[PDB]
From a paper:
In addition to Cbk1 intact in its HM region, we used a variant in which threonine 743 was replaced by glutamic acid, an activating substitution that is at least partially phosphomimetic. We also solved the structure of Cbk1(HM-E)–Mob2 in a crystal form that diffracted to 3.6 Å, containing two Cbk1(HM-E)–Mob2 complexes in the asymmetric unit related by noncrystallographic symmetry (NCS). Cbk1’s activation loop forms multiple different structures: the higher resolution Cbk1(HM-E)–Mob2 crystallographic model captures two of these conformations displayed by the two NCS-related models. In one form, structured parts of the activation loop occupy the substrate-binding pocket and thus occlude access to the catalytic site, similar to the structure of PKA complexed with an alpha helical peptide inhibitor. In the other complex, the activation loop is not present in the substrate-binding region. We suggest that this is an auto-inhibited form of the kinase, while the other state seen in one of the two complexes present in Cbk1(HM-E) crystals may be competent to bind substrates containing basic amino acids (right). Although crystal packing interactions around the kinase activation loop are clearly different for the two complexes of the Cbk1(HM-E)–Mob2 model, it is likely that the extended activation loop of NDR/LATS kinases switches them between an inhibited and open state, with phosphorylation of the conserved autoregulatory site S570 (near AMPPNP in Fig 2C, left) alleviating the pseudo-substrate-based inhibition exerted by the inhibitory helix (αINH). In our crystal structures, unphosphorylated wild-type (WT) HM region (HM-T) and HM region with glutamic acid substitution (HM-E) associate with the Mob2-supported binding site in a similar manner. Similar MD analysis of the Cbk1(HM-E)–Mob2 structure indicates that HM-E also has more restrained movement of the HM region within the binding slot than HM-T, but slot compression was significantly less pronounced compared to HM-P. This suggests that HM-E is only a partial substitute for HM-P.
In the RAM network, the hippo-like kinase Kic1 activates the NDR-related kinase Cbk1, which forms a complex with the coactivator protein Mob2. Here we describe the crystal structure of the yeast Cbk1–Mob2 complex, providing what is to our knowledge the first structural template for an NDR/LATS kinase–Mob coactivator complex. In each structure, Mob2 binds to the conserved N-terminal extension of the Cbk1 AGC kinase domain, a region previously identified as the site by which NDR kinases bind Mob proteins. In all three structures, the Cbk1 HM peptide is wedged into a binding slot in the deep cleft formed by the kinase’s αMob helix, N-linker region, and N-terminal catalytic domain lobe.
Residue numbers in the entry:
A (entry chain A): 282 to 391, 407 to 508, 549 to 714, 740 to 749
B (entry chain B): 100 to 148, 182 to 278
Write the structure that this text describes.
Amino acid sequence: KAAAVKLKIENFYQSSVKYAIERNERRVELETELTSHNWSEERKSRQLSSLGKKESQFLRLRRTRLSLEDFHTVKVIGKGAFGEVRLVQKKDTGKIYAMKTLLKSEMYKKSDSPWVVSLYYSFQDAQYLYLIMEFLPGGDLMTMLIRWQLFTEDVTRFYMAECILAIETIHKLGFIHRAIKPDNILIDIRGHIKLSDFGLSTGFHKTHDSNYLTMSNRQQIQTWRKSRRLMAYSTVGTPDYIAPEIFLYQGYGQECDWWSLGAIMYECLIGWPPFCSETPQETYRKIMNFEQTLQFPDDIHISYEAEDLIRRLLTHADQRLGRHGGADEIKSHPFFRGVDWNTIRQVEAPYIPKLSSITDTRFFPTDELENVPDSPAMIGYEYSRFDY
Amino acid sequence: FVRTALVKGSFKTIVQLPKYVDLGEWIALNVFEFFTNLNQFYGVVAEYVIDLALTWINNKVNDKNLFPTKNGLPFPQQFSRDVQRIMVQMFRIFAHIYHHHFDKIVHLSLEAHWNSFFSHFISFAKEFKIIDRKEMAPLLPLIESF
Ligand SMILES: Nc1ncnc2c1ncn2[C@@H]1O[C@H](COP(=O)(O)OP(=O)(O)NP(=O)(O)O)[C@@H](O)[C@H]1O
């Protein structure tokens, strides 16, 4: 509250010193690139052979230019509120592709391995992010679980397992998914398992939903339990698995994913997740309990060992006394006669998908939904090495 | 007027066309950068007081025929001609900016950044000889420091 004299200058467009400090990188970067052009002289000198004109030639490469509409859309595949995934063809080349149209704002939270869905690149318009993925043809698992509610035995064993090994490898690669949910597990050509990823698709469940003569007419537990598959989703995301380490405070870790697994196993045998609520918030509820509220029906058929899994799978995420300690011991459960833990990847699959042609969407609720409370309504190559 | 010489880097290497590449693809790359480069440069200077040619530059580079965006498609070698012209689209901007509008720029004291950038554009030109030493009349003396 005294007085001051800077003085001369102001700052007007003074924010474009970015244009100064930034093109630093442009040079810093420009430096290290053509030093990567020194990748030449690979020269395996075990070779006394030709000669014979040139050992090589190149285009070499190019960043060219890019955008959407080099893409021809096939079918709406599936959805999230972040957006629709989709099947698409490249116009420019053309081939089979998973397009997940995802959302840029408004959105929060601001390889060498067979086991998951393989993405390639990302491209976007103003509005949406476009995720261009290997398109996994067998459907999600959920769409399988729907067509038939698996009678399993060796099948849920099979559909599981490779779960673990993948998830193992993931975990082993130092990642927890915290989404293990059927629409998000993926069946391939072989009917085998790659599980994809969140993208990252975020938003999450808290804090507590508290509302506060008769009749009847439910007439069966399972009947009652048919109330699922309710408007596809079209709000979501439900807590199928949702190991109970997430809420309230910080937590989780691999145990959540195995929980999520065991929970998943529970359904795929039972044709419904352990905690199925009839309302979004009737989980947490029983999920905050299990114990007494982890509940198997009196439809009798189960293994002693298989039952043992899910329970110790759905037992606490508890550390301290215990190991868990999983992904093996999870290999070491009595529920497993085999397998090799190896041959698994090529083993006659419980369903080898049978298709007419390459585009067949017969494995999906192609359907139509089209609700995206966003749209008014109304690219680049910076990558490095080559493919492939 | 004007002014010069603070610094970034050394020395001059990068501009030469690397081996076994369609020079055209190679040409086509680099030419496009410099475009966007000045764009971002003028944008501090912007207002406070080419669209065609930059777009004629744009439209040149966004001509598929002259511009083998796609693959290892070679360039027409009139693409090698399309570019010799397309380049010269560029020097117009530098000079005047430097001639007249540098004034502002130096106030920014971001000068060591525009210096290397302007110096840059040169090195490619004369190593690849994309221009004549006669049309150099307006920019002649400054270059002479080296
Ligand atoms: N890489 C993929 N390949 C094939 N199908 C996929 C792929 N990713 C997701 N899907 C399927 O398309 C639907 C939606 O994409 P998805 O990633 O699952 O949605 P989202 O916006 O991530 N969140 P959510 O839809 O609830 O899982 C899924 O239910 C699956 O059927």
